[PDB]
Coordinates of C-alpha atoms in Angstrom, one line a residue:
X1 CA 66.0 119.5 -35.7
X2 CA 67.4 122.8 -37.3
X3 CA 66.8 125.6 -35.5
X4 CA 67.4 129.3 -36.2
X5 CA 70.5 128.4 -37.9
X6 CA 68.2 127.7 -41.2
X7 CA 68.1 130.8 -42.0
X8 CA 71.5 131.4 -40.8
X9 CA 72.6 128.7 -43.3
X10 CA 71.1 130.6 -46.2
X11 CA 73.4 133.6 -46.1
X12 CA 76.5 131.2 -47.3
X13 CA 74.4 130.4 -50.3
X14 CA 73.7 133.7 -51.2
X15 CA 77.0 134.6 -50.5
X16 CA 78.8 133.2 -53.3
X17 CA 75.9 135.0 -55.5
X18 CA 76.7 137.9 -54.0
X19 CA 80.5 137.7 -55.0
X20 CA 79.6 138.0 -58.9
X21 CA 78.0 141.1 -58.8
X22 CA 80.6 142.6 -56.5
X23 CA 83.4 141.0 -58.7
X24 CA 82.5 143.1 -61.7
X25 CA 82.2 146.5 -59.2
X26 CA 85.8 145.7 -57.9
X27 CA 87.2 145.9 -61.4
X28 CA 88.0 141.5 -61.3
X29 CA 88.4 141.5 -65.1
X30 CA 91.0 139.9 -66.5
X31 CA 91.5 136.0 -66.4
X32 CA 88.3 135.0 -66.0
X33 CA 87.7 131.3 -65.1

């Protein structure tokens, strides 16, 4: 049974879709993968 760590669990998702945008605000551009 999951409990309120369901949502919880949805934040490292996003997380890694968060890291994009706030790559290119950072100034990350240069190797690129």
């Amino acid at each position: 049974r999951r409990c309120l760590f369901l949502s919880l669990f949805s934040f490292l998702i996003v997380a890694g879709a968060t890291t994009l945008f706030c790559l290119l605000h950072f100034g990350v551009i240069g190797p690129q993968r």
